[PDB]
Write a protein that binds this ligand. Structure first.
Ligand SMILES: NCCOB(c1ccccc1)c1ccccc1
Ligand SMILES: NCCOB(c1ccccc1)c1ccccc1
Ligand SMILES: [Ca+2]
Lengths: 611, 611
């Protein structure tokens, strides 16, 4: 219950101004009552409000230069007094001066030589969803947000440093990026480029990283400020000759492609969470770049890894179906004559000329697990375990269960060396999601991907949400069937002889898979005949409602936004096999420079056609 | 990896201008540095760039007449020097002159009497999807594309030949057709008609074929430049009397209908691949023309061929169900008591008075195959075998399996003369797609067609795309069921006694047909009870997702574009039974001329109503 303290103190603002007749005249334009306040006696200049205010704080906050200049002969040092703490740590009147777009107080508090080096790093000033705004803390950082032109010109003419950085290391240029009024603040980008003039030996400010290592170029990408990205792009592209309707411009491509792990661009559009950012893939240098990364040595060296993979599964299944598999030897099946099993999975029979063939069929698989184990000993070391789930679901949640493939297929070889009876429990799991993970490769072969994308987005958000609701409407009828047939002999009509199978038999009855029980040779008890019917009108309702649960997402799908999610998925493939596959088979994308007056920067061009 | 060489040489353009101070001044407006370049010494006039450039090439390409005229006293012969090779084979400054819409250099390089006979047949200039533009190679061919009026007037006043043809034989008039800015280039059609004046004895240019035999009338049709087609149509139609709101105009109809195999119009809208072309059927002379070809002696002589066809199938099925069919005579069924068969298909029993009736019931069918064999001995000779598949899917993919009907129904008579045991393997196939091909005739009977059209577009693009995805999610569970019931006796619960039926029994379980395997008399092994359930929540997912896989196409369907695909399908019928059925029963469409001051051209009229 944190946010209550915001408001408790904010009414305490209205408390302290209420008791104070000086601050009562700081509310409105009571300059003639300010004449009644300062010339008649010595009131102290430190009349602190709820979080430590003075008059020109309150006066400029309630839009009053007329109350602001009359304290100047009263107290010139109160410009040097910031607001105290805990929400507004270091806030001065200069900062709220530009909040109200002007009052000409900006020259007037600069007539008391106010300091732009004041940093208001308080609670409400850092980036958080509990604060509905974000501004940085330097005053010129605020003036970029408010889109007030000559105000920015005014303070740089009085000693403003543009290269100053926030609590996170973001300069003022980052702060212009994170404004939700995007094109309306775009015009102040090049204005703040216009005061770069002294070229520092480290940066001309547009390559400045923050303490999360983001130059504000790609910070616009990882936030997805799309229209600002283009205006930022146009200075960086190097256009060559134009040929009538077409133009052979030439894009920069320095930080865009993967280079030596400097947190390159493409992995950051993947690993972010804000889904408006993925529309940066619809921008002119980027969509065609990933196309050539996907057309040439994209899918055919991807699907080649797919091609060996189902062969790995085929050589798994043949060494899965041929099993030790002896006849029934220890005992006859005594209990109940229900133990309908005879096979018992042999201890140490391998020397036959069939069992050598399965052995080379075997150990290729368990070593093949250890290959995809060694994929993850750096990769679990890379992005943790618990937030690795936070890496999964957005792009490749098929990646995680190929590892639970490996846990089971390793433990079943541990199982065969011990030869315990519980052998099928891995071998069930180790077979089914082996095949179920070949649909991860459906993205590579064309036109087959997007349903498998839509497979993903229906199961993890809708069907498991449905399976919450479905797993309780069963348990009524299932247990209601279970008690209603405790009365009856399970010799005939034996679906419900005990409670654990009574759930399962109801469950498969729920999907209308089983015939619907009914002897028709004896009588059935009376409430069976309606409750099963009372299950039926539910069975025709909610799975039919589940059929249309699909549709309310599907109108939000393909007509609008699965097609982007397909190619958003294709690049989550792209940087990841770029990373995991080492060099000397991938040549990195685009043309290299260094032979053409360009140097170490590699480039990429495209044609077009205008009007 | 071909397209890399485009860019490697295109940076080499920027390499050669970089080393050359003459070409450095050819970049921008360095005429005072051109004073520093030519008057002071004799620099050679052949300073070749990457693919062989000179200065006025580079100057006019970077929009500089001011650099262009200063080399004229330096080198007047460099107009006669084309760009060298391998991309731009024969490109001169005259060609790039009209690319930049003007510079008044067009008169100025004609002051050195430049040649419009220059043909730039280089790599980037022919029609290809690797080139984003298409222009032809004569300079007047370029000026039609750029839509620059008096520029076209200027060069014809200096010796331009309009009748010149490209590498493919297309003249300049074809080049105006293939511009993607369609109405914006439409105004230059009649302008280039306006300089026809000398009537040549062969053509007045608007009947010129190319080396694929396309007069640029129907070339607009086969590409589907719809709005240009109408403006091209209006001069060709011959309007008669107007009666207030109605007008009895009279359309030309020379090349539109099928005539003596001169690659007529209607078959070309069918056999093309670009699906924007089929909207030429929505144009005023064409839609009503095919209507009268379909209303009168269209369907009733089509459905008549349908009417004999199911009678052929009925007289096939009666000679399919009555079979030789002897009792069990060679041996008792010894193995396993599973060989539940007794019939063995008699060798040479035909003389009974029932078996003569099936014999006349027989040989009508195998001869009836040979009729639809003789349809194809010219037709396989017509359009090949492998690209005949490229004829199938767009219109009548039902046509191909009536031929695999014929292969099987021929081989089963080969089979009865040998009387091998494998008799049902054709007879299964020869029966099922015999009936399944009567739905080809669903297009003829009204309102029944479009679902059978939608049958086609769901199976060959979506369900076989689904059956990729579905055939792997089965094999997990199916083999997982197969290993989990290797343990168990297949006497009771015998769905999965071996692997080949284990797939099929899972497959029909997947569509929730089979009952779902459960004895309820014995115990079942433990991972059966969840993995079958783990099959169930997939079984309620993806075939339910397949249900809505239909819908994302269906919103792209009937609300917008199946109704055109229906009548696009009806004319693919129309020219084909026009072709395959010979004369003396079809009278060719429209009214004949030759009695009415019109001659050999046959015509067709229509009424209307305007505002
Ligand atoms: N095979 C290793 C799994 O890695 B996958 C993956 C790796 C990093 C981030 C997200 C997913 C994956 C890659 C392509 C397709 C499916 C999954
Ligand atoms: N019966 C011969 C098959 O020819 B069909 C056909 C012929 C040429 C091109 C495409 C298809 C066909 C014609 C009408 C309906 C269905 C198929
Ligand atoms: Ca049943």
């Amino acid at each position: 219950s944190w946010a209550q303290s915001r408001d408790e103190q904010n009414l305490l603002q209205q408390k302290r101004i209420w008791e104070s007749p000086l601050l009562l005249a700081a509310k409105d334009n009571d300059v003639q009552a300010l004449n009644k306040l300062l010339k008649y006696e010595d009131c102290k200049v430190h009349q602190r409000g709820a979080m430590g205010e003075t008059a020109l704080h309150i006066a400029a906050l309630y839009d009053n230069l007329e109350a602001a200049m009359v304290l100047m002969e009263a107290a010139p040092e109160l410009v040097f007094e910031p607001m105290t703490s805990e929400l507004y740590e270091g806030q001065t009147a200069l900062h709220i001066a530009v909040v109200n777009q002007n009052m000409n107080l900006v020259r007037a508090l600069l007539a008391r030589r106010a300091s732009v080096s004041a940093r208001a790093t308080g609670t409400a000033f850092r980036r958080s969803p509990c604060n509905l705004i974000y501004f940085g803390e330097h005053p010129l950082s605020f003036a970029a947000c408010v889109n007030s032109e000559e105000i920015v010109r005014l303070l740089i003419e009085h000693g403003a440093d543009i290269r100053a950085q926030d609590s996170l290391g973001n300069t003022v240029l980052h702060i212009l990026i994170l404004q939700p009024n995007k094109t309306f603040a775009c015009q102040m980008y090049n204005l703040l480029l216009s005061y770069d003039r002294h070229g520092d030996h480290l940066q001309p400010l547009d390559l400045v990283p923050n303490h999360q290592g983001l130059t504000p170029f790609k910070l616009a990408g990882v936030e997805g400020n799309t229209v600002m990205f283009q205006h930022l792009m146009q200075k960086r592209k190097h256009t060559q000759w134009t040929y009538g309707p077409l133009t052979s411009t030439l894009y920069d491509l320095t930080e865009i492609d993967s280079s030596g792990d400097e947190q390159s661009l493409l992995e950051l559009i993947i690993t972010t969470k804000k889904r408006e950012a993925r529309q940066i893939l619809d921008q002119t240098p980027v969509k065609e770049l990933v196309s050539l990364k996907w057309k040439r040595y994209g899918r055919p060296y991807f699907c080649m890894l797919g091609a060996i993979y189902l062969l790995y599964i085929i050589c798994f299944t043949m060494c899965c179906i041929y099993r030790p598999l002896k006849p029934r030897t220890n005992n006859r099946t005594s209990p109940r004559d229900n133990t309908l099993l005879q096979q018992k999975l042999l201890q140490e029979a391998y020397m036959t000329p069939k069992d050598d063939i399965r052995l080379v069929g075997e150990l290729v698989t368990v070593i093949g697990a250890i290959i995809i184990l060694l994929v993850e000993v750096p990769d679990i070391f890379r992005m943790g375990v618990t937030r690795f789930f936070g890496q999964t679901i957005l792009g490749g949640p098929f990646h995680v269960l190929i590892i639970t493939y490996a846990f089971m297929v390793l433990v079943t070889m541990v199982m065969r060396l011990i030869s315990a009876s519980g052998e099928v429990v891995p071998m069930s799991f180790a077979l089914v999601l082996g095949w179920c993970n070949v649909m991860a490769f459906a993205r590579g072969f064309q036109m087959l991907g997007p349903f498998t994308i839509m497979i993903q987005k229906m199961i993890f958000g809708d069907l498991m949400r449905f399976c919450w609701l479905m797993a309780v409407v069963i348990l009524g009828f299932a247990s209601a069937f279970y008690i209603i047939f405790q009365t009856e002999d399970p010799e005939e009509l034996g679906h419900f002889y005990d409670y654990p199978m009574a759930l399962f038999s109801t469950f498969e009855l729920f999907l209308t898979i089983i015939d619907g029980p009914a002897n028709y040779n004896v009588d059935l008890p009376f409430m069976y005949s309606i409750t099963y019917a009372a299950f039926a009108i539910i069975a025709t309702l909610l799975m039919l409602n589940l059929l249309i649960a699909m549709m309310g997402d599907t109108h939000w799908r393909v007509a609008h936004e699965r097609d982007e999610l397909w190619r958003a998925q294709i690049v989550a493939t792209t940087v990841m096999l770029e990373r995991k596959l080492p060099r000397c088979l991938w040549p990195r994308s685009g043309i290299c420079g260094r032979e053409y007056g360009l140097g170490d920067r590699w480039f990429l061009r495209v044609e077009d056609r205008q009007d």
